[PDB]
């Protein structure tokens, strides 16, 4: 169900955005979980370019420069 499905997202900032914040924060803290942001809502949160639409190319371009020599 859409709430639970939302709950099972990879990024913990996404889950923290709208659910019981304490729950997700404690889970992520104990798990040592690592959020690469990878998504739309996180990118909004940090105030960088969305990977959607006009900004998709940017991130795609970044991907070639990212994780390379």
């Amino acid at each position: 169900g859409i709430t639970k499905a939302s709950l099972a997202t990879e990024s913990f900032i996404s889950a923290a955005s709208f659910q019981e914040t304490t729950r997700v924060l404690t889970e992520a803290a104990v798990a040592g979980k690592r959020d690469e942001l990878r998504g739309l809502k996180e990118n909004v949160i940090v105030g960088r370019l969305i990977p959607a639409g006009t900004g998709y190319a940017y991130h795609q371009d970044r991907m070639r420069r990212r994780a390379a020599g």
């Binding site: 859409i2 709430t3 499905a5 939302s6 996404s14 998504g39 739309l40 809502k41 990977p51 998709y56």
Partner: protein
């Protein structure tokens, strides 16, 4: 209520008949003033789950597909084929009702 309101707005209603319609309208107003909050919550959840979906690839190249028919709910064809299929990409070649077409 068993007895209805016999008069209409061109003519004039009477005390009790008004009273009744008053109740009707009051309930209606509250109804809306709550359908707005519920619809807002629902749509927020919906956009929440569906945030990340972006068209990333040009063509996945699968042979899979779903069989679309005209929804003939019981008595008749409530919604035809054409509107349900307009603007969708095809999964495979369609034949006339007669093979090799």
């Amino acid at each position: 209520i068993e007895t209805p309101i016999t008069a209409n707005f061109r003519e004039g209603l009477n005390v009790l008949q008004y009273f009744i319609s008053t109740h009707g309208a009051r309930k209606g107003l509250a109804d809306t003033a709550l359908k707005t909050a519920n619809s807002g919550y629902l749509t927020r959840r919906l956009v929440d789950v569906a945030q990340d979906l972006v068209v990333t690839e040009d063509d996945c190249g699968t042979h899979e597909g779903i069989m679309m028919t005209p929804v003939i709910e019981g008595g008749d064809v409530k919604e035809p084929l054409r509107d349900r299929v307009l603007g969708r990409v095809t999964a495979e070649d369609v034949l006339k009702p007669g093979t090799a077409d």
